[PDB]
Amino acid sequence: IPWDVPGMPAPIKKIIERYIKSKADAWVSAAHYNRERIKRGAHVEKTMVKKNLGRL
Amino acid sequence: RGGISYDQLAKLSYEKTLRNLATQTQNSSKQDKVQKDTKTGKITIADDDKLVNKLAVSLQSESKKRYEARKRQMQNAKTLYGVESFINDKNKQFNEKLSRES
Amino acid sequence: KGGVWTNVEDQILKAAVQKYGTHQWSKVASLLQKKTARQSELRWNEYLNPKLNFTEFSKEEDAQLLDLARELPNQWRTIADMMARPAQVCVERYNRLLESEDSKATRKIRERMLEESKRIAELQKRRELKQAGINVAIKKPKKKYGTDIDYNEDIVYEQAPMPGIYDTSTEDRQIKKKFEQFERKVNRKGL
Amino acid sequence: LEELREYQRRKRTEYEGYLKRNRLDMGQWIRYAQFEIEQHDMRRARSIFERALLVDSSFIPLWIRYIDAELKVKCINHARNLMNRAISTLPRVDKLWYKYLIVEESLNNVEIVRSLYTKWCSLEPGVNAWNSF
Amino acid sequence: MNYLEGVGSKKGGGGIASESQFNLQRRKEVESLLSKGENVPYTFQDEQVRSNPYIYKNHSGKLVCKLCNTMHMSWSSVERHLGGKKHGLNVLRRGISIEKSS
Amino acid sequence: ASGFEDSMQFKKLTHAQRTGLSQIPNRRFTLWWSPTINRANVYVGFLVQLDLTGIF
Amino acid sequence: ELLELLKSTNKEIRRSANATFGFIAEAIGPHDVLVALLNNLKVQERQLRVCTAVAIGIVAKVCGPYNVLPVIMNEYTTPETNVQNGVLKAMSFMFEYIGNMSKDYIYFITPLLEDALTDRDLVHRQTASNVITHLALNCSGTGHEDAFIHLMNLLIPNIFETSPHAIMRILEGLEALSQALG
RNA sequence: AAUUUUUAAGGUAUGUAUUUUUUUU
RNA sequence: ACGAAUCUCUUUGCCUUUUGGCUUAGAUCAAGUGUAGUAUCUGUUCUUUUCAGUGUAACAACUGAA
Ligand SMILES: [Mg+2]
Ligand SMILES: [Mg+2]
Ligand SMILES: [Zn+2]
DSSP string, D43-96: HHHHHHHHHHHHH-SS-HHHHHHHHHHHHHTT-HHHHHHHHHHHHHHSTT-SHH
CA-based nearest distance E34→chain F, Å: 28
- How far apart CA A11 and CA A16 sit, in angstroms, is 9
Q: Are G116 and G124 in contact (CB under 8 A)?
A: yes
Beta-strand (E) ranges in E1-102?
55-57, 63-65, 70-72
Q: Which DSSP symbol is given to E64?
A: E
CA of F17 to the centre of ligand 1 (A): 14
Give, for G179, the enclosing helix (H) or strand (E). Answer: helix G164-181
With CB atoms and an 8 Å threshold, state whether C31 touches E76: no
- How far apart CA G106 and CA G145 sit, in angstroms, is 11
Crossing angle for the helix pair C59-71 and C76-83, nearest 10 degrees?
150
With CB atoms and an 8 Å threshold, state whether C12 touches E34: yes
3-state DSSP call for residue G67?
Answer: helix
Q: Distance of alpha carbon D106 from its chain centroid, rounded? A: 18
Residues contacting G68, CB < 8 A, separation 6+: G30, G34, G56, G59, G60, G94
With 0-12 / 13-18 / 19 or more C-beta atoms within 10 angstroms meaning exposed / middle / buried, residue D94 is buried
Which nucleotide comes closest to F13 if you measure CA to C1'? I29
With 0-12 / 13-18 / 19 or more C-beta atoms within 10 angstroms meaning exposed / middle / buried, residue G7 is middle
Q: Are G170 and G158 in contact (CB under 8 A)?
A: yes
Crossing angle for the helix pair D95-105 and D110-122, nearest 10 degrees?
160
- How far apart CA B98 and CA B94 sit, in angstroms, is 6
CA angle A32, A35, A40 (to 5 degrees): 130
Distance B2 CA to I16 C1' (A): 22
Distance F55 CA to H3 C1' (A): 32
3-state DSSP call for residue E85?
Answer: coil
Residues contacting D130, CB < 8 A, separation 6+: D121
Cβ count near C67 (within 10 Å): 14
- How far apart CA C58 and CA C97 sit, in angstroms, is 13
Q: Which of G55, G122, C15, C103 is nearest to E71 (CA)?
A: G122
Q: Which of D62, D118, D131 is nearest to D90 (CA)?
A: D62
Q: Sign of the CA dihedral G30, G36, G41, G46? A: negative
Q: Go through chain C and tell me how many residues it has.
A: 191
- How far apart CA C137 and CA C126 sit, in angstroms, is 8
Helix then strand then coil, % of chain C, to nearest 5: 55, 0, 45
Distance B19 CA to I2 C1' (A): 18
Where helices occur in chain B by DSSP H, the ranges are 6-31, 52-80, 89-101
Crossing angle for the helix pair B6-31 and D95-105, nearest 10 degrees?
10
CA-based nearest distance C161→chain D, Å: 6
CA of E7 to the centre of ligand 2 (A): 13
Please state, in angstroms and as integers, the Cα–Cα distance from residue D34 to each residue in D14, D30, D37, D38, F47, following that order: 14, 6, 5, 6, 70
3-state DSSP call for residue E65?
Answer: strand
Q: Are C33 and C26 in contact (CB under 8 A)?
A: no
With CB atoms and an 8 Å threshold, state whether C166 touches B37: no
Judge whether B43 is closer than 8 Å to chain C, CB to CB: yes
Give, for G148, the enclosing helix (H) or strand (E). Answer: helix G147-155
Start-to-end Cα distance in chain F: 31
- How far apart CA E50 and CA F4 sit, in angstroms, is 57
Q: Sign of the CA dihedral C176, C182, C187, C188? A: positive
- How far apart CA B9 and CA D17 sit, in angstroms, is 37
Backbone angles phi, psi at B35, to 5 degrees: -135, 115
Amino acid at G152: M
Backbone angles phi, psi at B44, to 5 degrees: -135, 140
CA-derived radius of gyration, chain E: 22
What is the number of CB-based contacts under 8 A between chain E and chain F? Answer: 22
With CB atoms and an 8 Å threshold, state whether E16 touches F16: no
Q: Are D52 and D29 in contact (CB under 8 A)?
A: yes
- How far apart CA C23 and CA C189 sit, in angstroms, is 62
Please state, in angstroms and as integers, the Cα–Cα distance from residue A53 to each residue in A35, A41, A42, A45, following that order: 9, 16, 16, 13
Task: Find chains touching chain D: ≥3 CB pairs under 8 Å.
Answer: B, C
Task: Find chains touching chain C: ≥3 CB pairs under 8 Å.
Answer: B, D, E
With CB atoms and an 8 Å threshold, state whether E37 touches B88: yes
With 0-12 / 13-18 / 19 or more C-beta atoms within 10 angstroms meaning exposed / middle / buried, residue B90 is exposed
Amino acid at E75: W
Q: Sign of the CA dihedral C32, C35, C38, C43? A: negative
* C15: nearest CA partner in chain B: B85
Q: Which DSSP symbol is given to C135?
A: -
- How far apart CA D122 and CA D114 sit, in angstroms, is 12
- How far apart CA D111 and CA D109 sit, in angstroms, is 6
- How far apart CA D75 and CA D42 sit, in angstroms, is 10
Q: Which residues of E touch B (CB under 8 A)?
A: 32, 36-37, 49, 51
Please state, in angstroms and as integers, the Cα–Cα distance from residue C96 to each residue in C87, C89, C189, G108, following that order: 14, 11, 90, 74
**Residue B14: its chain D contacts at CB < 8 A?**
98, 101-102, 132
The data reach a resolution, in angstroms, of: 3.5
Q: In the sheet where E70-72 sits, what is the strand order?
A: E55-57, E63-65, E70-72
User: From which experimental method does this structure derive?
Assistant: cryo-EM
b/e map E58-83, b = 16+ CB within 10 Å: bbbebbbbebbebebebbbebeebee
On strand H, nucleotides with any atom < 7 Å from a protein CB are 5-7, 10-13, 15-17
With CB atoms and an 8 Å threshold, state whether E26 touches C33: yes
Q: Which of B95, B25, B89 is nearest to B54 (CA)?
A: B25
Q: Which DSSP symbol is given to C142?
A: -
Judge whether E23 is closer than 8 Å to chain G, CB to CB: yes
3-state DSSP call for residue C144?
Answer: coil
Q: What is the DSSP string of B42-65?
A: -EE----STTHHHHHHHHHHHHHH
Cβ count near B55 (within 10 Å): 18
Q: After which residues does chain A show a gap where C to N exceeds 2.5 Å?
A: none
Please state, in angstroms and as integers, the Cα–Cα distance from residue G149 to each residue in E84, G132, G159, G168, G182, following that order: 45, 12, 16, 20, 11
Which nucleotide comes closest to C24 if you measure CA to C1'? I25
Looking at the 3D structure of chain B, how many domains does it have? 1
Please state, in angstroms and as integers, the Cα–Cα distance from residue G160 to each residue in F28, G122, G156, G163, G168, following that order: 73, 12, 8, 10, 12
**Residue E23: its chain G contacts at CB < 8 A?**
43-45
Backbone angles phi, psi at E70, to 5 degrees: -110, 155
Which nucleotide comes closest to C34 if you measure CA to C1'? I31
Q: Are C7 and C43 in contact (CB under 8 A)?
A: no
Give, for B36, the enclosing helix (H) or strand (E). Answer: strand B35-36
Report protein residues in contact with nucleic acid strand H, where contact means CB under 7 Å.
Answer: C 141-142, 144; E 1, 3, 8, 11; F 43-46
Q: Which of G57, G83, G78 is nearest to G68 (CA)?
A: G57
Residues contacting G88, CB < 8 A, separation 6+: G76, G116, G124, G127, G128, G130, G131
Pairing of strands E63-65, B35-36: unpaired
Distance G166 CA to I38 C1' (A): 9
CA-based nearest distance B61→chain E, Å: 29
3-state DSSP call for residue G129?
Answer: helix
Q: Which of B8, G17, B39 is nearest to D95 (CA)?
A: B8
- Its domain, for residue B66, covers 1-102
Cβ count near B38 (within 10 Å): 5
Q: Are G69 and E47 in contact (CB under 8 A)?
A: no
Judge whether D90 is closer than 8 Å to chain C, CB to CB: no
Q: Which DSSP symbol is given to E42?
A: B
- How far apart CA C170 and CA C29 sit, in angstroms, is 72
CA-based nearest distance B15→chain E, Å: 41
Amino acid at B29: S
- How far apart CA G181 and CA E26 sit, in angstroms, is 49
CA-based nearest distance E29→chain C, Å: 7
Hey, which residues does E56 pair with through a beta bridge?
E64
Which nucleotide comes closest to C27 if you measure CA to C1'? I30
Amino acid at C27: K
Residues contacting B7, CB < 8 A, separation 6+: D94, D128
**Residue C15: its chain E contacts at CB < 8 A?**
33-34
Beta-strand (E) ranges in G91-159?
none
Q: Which long-range contacts (CB under 8 A, 24 or more apart) does B46-49 make?
A: B47/D76, B47/D107, B48/D108
- How far apart CA D100 and CA D122 sit, in angstroms, is 17
**Residue G127: its chain E contacts at CB < 8 A?**
none
- How far apart CA E50 and CA E78 sit, in angstroms, is 15
On strand I, nucleotides with any atom < 7 Å from a protein CB are 3-10, 12-18, 23-25, 27-32, 37-44
Residues contacting B6, CB < 8 A, separation 6+: D94, D95
Q: Are E81 and E87 in contact (CB under 8 A)?
A: yes
3-state DSSP call for residue G110?
Answer: coil
CA angle E10, E16, E22 (to 5 degrees): 135
Residues contacting C146, CB < 8 A, separation 6+: none
**Helices (runs of H) and strands (runs of E) counted in chain G:** 11, 0
- How far apart CA A43 and CA A52 sit, in angstroms, is 13
Crossing angle for the helix pair E19-33 and C7-20, nearest 10 degrees?
80
Task: Find chains touching chain A: ≥3 CB pairs under 8 Å.
Answer: none
